[PDB]
Design a protein around this nucleic acid. Structure first.
Lengths: 118, 48, 52
RNA sequence: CUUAGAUGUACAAGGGGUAUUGUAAGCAGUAGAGUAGCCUUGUUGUUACGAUCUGCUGAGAUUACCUUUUGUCUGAUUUGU
RNA sequence: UCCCACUGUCCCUAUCUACUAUCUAGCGAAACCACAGCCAAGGGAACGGGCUUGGCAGAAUCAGCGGGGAAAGAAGACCCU
RNA sequence: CUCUAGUGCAGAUCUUGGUGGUAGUAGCAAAUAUUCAAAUGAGAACUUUGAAGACUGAAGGGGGAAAGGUUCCACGUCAACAGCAGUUGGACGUGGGUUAGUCGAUCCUAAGAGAUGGGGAAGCUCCGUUUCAAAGGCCUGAUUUUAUGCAGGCCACCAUCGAAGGGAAUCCGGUUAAGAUUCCGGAACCUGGUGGUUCUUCACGGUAACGUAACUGAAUGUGGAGACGUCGCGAGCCCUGGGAGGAGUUAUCUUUUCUUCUUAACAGCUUAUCACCCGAAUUGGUUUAUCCGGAAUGGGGUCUUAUGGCUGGAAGAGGCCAGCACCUUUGCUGGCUCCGGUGCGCUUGACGGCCGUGAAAAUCCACAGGAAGGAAUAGUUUUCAUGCCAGGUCGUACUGAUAACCGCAGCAGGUCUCCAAGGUGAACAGCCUCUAGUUGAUAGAAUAAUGUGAUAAGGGAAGUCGGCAAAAUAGAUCCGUAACUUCGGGAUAAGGAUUGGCUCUAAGUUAGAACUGGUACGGACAAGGGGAAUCUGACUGUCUAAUUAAAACAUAGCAUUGCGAUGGU
RNA sequence: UGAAUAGGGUGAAGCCAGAGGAAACUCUGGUGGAGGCUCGUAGCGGUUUGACGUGCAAAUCGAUCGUCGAAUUUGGGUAUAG
RNA sequence: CGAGAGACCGAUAGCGAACAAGUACAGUGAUGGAAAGAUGAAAAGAACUUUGAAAAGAGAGUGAAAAAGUACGUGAAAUUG
């Protein structure tokens, strides 16, 4: 018993995917009678074609763990992202740690804080 | 694919011949079997 | 087994159909035809193409 | 093949008693160390927060257990020369 | 190969678990067609359920298991023209 | 009444087909739970809808090309036909829908190749195209027109063909049984028809000046570009908060708790690199610095490119969320916040530094700057202003891990290739949710033998062709450690010791102190067996497509011999 | 001729500085570049073991094993036929 | 293209094919290529009635005969009551 036309077009008129679209099981008779996109967009004004997403992807658990872990709790070694001093490459991180001494040293010579000799 | 010119009406001829066996056949015979051999099916044969 | 699924590639399309006859060894490369010829010179009716 | 069929215990089902890992939430109470707000200061007192502490009690959950009760089994089919 | 720790491979097997066998519905394969189907002794186209004598052998039915006949199959692998 | 021919069936692992046989037996398509209620009906586990759960989410999400070609779609049927039912299907039948200068359909360079004519020669074919050809400038004559078009004469400075790398244009919404950079609504750009002048060099007038009539095609180059091996350090580019609206949870309890909202093509504005800062006195840049910059010098002196930010478009538009009409079916009308801490995009062929030594071309750049010290100011075989028509010529549905391709097949298959969120673990392992999707053409109950999974006393290799199988161990950080070298090596040898968490050291990497407990601090997941003696091919590498992965052969390297290339072959 | 290797560890050669050495050795740090250096994914190879062979592909399926800036892998176009 | 005949067939023969045989189909492919004939004089091809849901089952009419009923000659066996 085909409502296959109604099933297909119900997704597209709201702008949601294949499975998500829900229907009101009481007045299924007028849904069948409404073939076209023009017709089923009147059913959007009723509020029978709605998506079924009744999940909140709540940041409560994720943001709580992220605050403790990225502070410095839990991750002594047990679950530990990046081994100790390293994560990004050990050589380039070391040489970048010495090249940020440029940023500090430079504007002393310029700024007239110290003599060239000293 | 990209289709050329003289491919299109060979394909149109094939899909026109995809219609049933003519119903005039067993008005001459009356009942008795006359079975045929062409059309085209989509899964099976392509056109020439 | 070396055969059938490898033949299911067929990226290089060799033969298309002939206009005058229906011999579909009308190669895009070679432009050959075992039957009457496409292109032809005279009508290529060959004698070995029959037993009876 | 043993067995139960309202007459009665074969199962589940309704209750009581015992064991199975061993000392819960709930509720009450105690000891030791550190920090902060507010108040006082030679002094200290008060309030708030997190871990540690004390007491009930073989607790709660809880299997096929021992012991005792609750729920159901018409017709139709159909046999002695 | 020697040497250290060691090992279900075995000694030594048991127990529990997943899935099916048992059993049922539906639609529905496969190459596939010898009269026939006991054993001990005896003769023998030469190792007989089948032929000679003697002992033995009933039917309705289903689950099992690898000994023969020698299965599922190709005109043998040795071997000569 | 007698003569003549394709003249008698049991068979070559034969021949033309139906029917028998195993047999209604197996199979019934790779172990991603399914439970319950309804709509409709002759019939419902399957269509379809609801409640609920398994399941995946670097794909069960998204999405283009080849190849195919209307299979999508709506309408319409349950017969044949679907590994079963079947209300269902691309099977069956009928028609519709795919609107481009706009997205693809071109020139020249490479792999590579074509067309034409005559000959060399036996054809094939090579060769000619390289000089005419082809294309362009200048001069003359006859005819005709709103224009025009043709013929003759003159000019040496060039010559084969084909990309993926080289070679036009574009964003956003409405709407569809279906879709528009396409129809359509709003805003762009390319292609032709209307209005405004700058230098060599020259004439007339005027002149510190500047104004204008006669007639004005125009860059086959000196020289430079489009133009190609490997490889390294920078310095910038996030999670979250703030403010506004709404609700305190079936059960003890909760209004600074959670969630939703938090936005927008273009032009103007104007930054790193380079070089007349070559030159170089001097010294900004972790710096070794000849270098280049604050700062200083010429001759008279300054400039290009450009992540981001600032400004304009936007008078206006959307949106958390509500107010009415009200026929109570159905239709409208009103409305909020707006801000601060950061990647592998782009910036860097320069620079650093090595070699195997870096291509070729049409369009096009290239085609040599004067005025005012510079300041300042204008135009360009160029750019601005402004009006009307036309855009060729098809592919365009749609599938593209597929029922359209493709394994004869409704078969456990082959199959180019696009996009990249949160927290946990390096990344792209694993872990697990989103945007987001879904459990297949038969089913129920018990759950033998036998084939398919784990556990355990005692022993410790004792067993079997066969340590095959199976066990010991594992991270982070510190200590401690073996022969000998082609000096490029071996080292994680052996032998030992400790973790997470919380407090404290410092009101902000990380490491050092300090305390307790359990079977155990990597507690899921994840994560090395060691000692002692011995061979060959130097090393990496090539390999028998349906029973031979090697000691076969190659390898950088080396020598003799052919051998002067019109070679040897 | 077109497309593809995220992540992660070391570092000669060149050049400078600092302690030390008659002088050279030695000896402590920074700057920096050449890898069959080297490591893990893409691309890509096949050692062991069990079930199949009247079945899904006319050599199949499950568990298990290798390489990756080098003698690297791969697509398309085009040519070579006993 | 037409006519006539030969010791020359009567649907396994013979032209590929007597008939919608190149037409439901299969292979890239000059190509392969099956199933396959049929009432009577007149179709009058069963009105009407009755049962069942269509299928299916009985009375009644038409017509020379319905002992000719559309799947339309004669009919055997495995198969199969």
């Amino acid at each position: 018993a085909n409502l296959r036309t109604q099933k297909r077009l119900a997704a597209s008129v709201v702008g949601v995917g294949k499975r998500k679209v829900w229907l009101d099981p009481n007045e299924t008779s007028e849904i069948a009678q409404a073939n076209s996109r023009n017709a089923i967009r009147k059913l959007v004004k009723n509020g029978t074609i709605v998506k079924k997403a009744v999940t909140v992807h709540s940041k409560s658990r994720t943001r709580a763990h992220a605050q403790s872990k990225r502070e410095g709790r839990h991750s002594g070694y047990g679950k530990r992202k990046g081994t100790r001093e390293a994560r990004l490459p050990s050589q380039v991180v070391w040489i970048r740690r010495l090249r940020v001494l440029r940023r500090l040293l430079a504007k002393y010579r310029d700024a007239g804080k110290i003599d060239k000799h000293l | 694919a990209q289709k050329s010119f003289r491919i299109k009406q060979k394909m149109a001829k094939a899909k026109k011949q995809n219609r049933p066996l003519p119903q005039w056949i067993r008005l001459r015979t009356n009942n008795t079997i006359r079975y045929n051999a062409k059309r085209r099916n989509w899964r099976r044969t392509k056109m020439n | 087994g070396k055969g059938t699924p490898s033949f299911g590639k067929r990226h290089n399309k060799s033969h298309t159909l002939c206009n005058r006859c229906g011999r579909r060894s009308f190669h895009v490369q070679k432009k050959t035809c075992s039957s009457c010829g496409y292109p032809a010179a005279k009508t290529r009716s060959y004698n070995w193409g029959a037993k009876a």
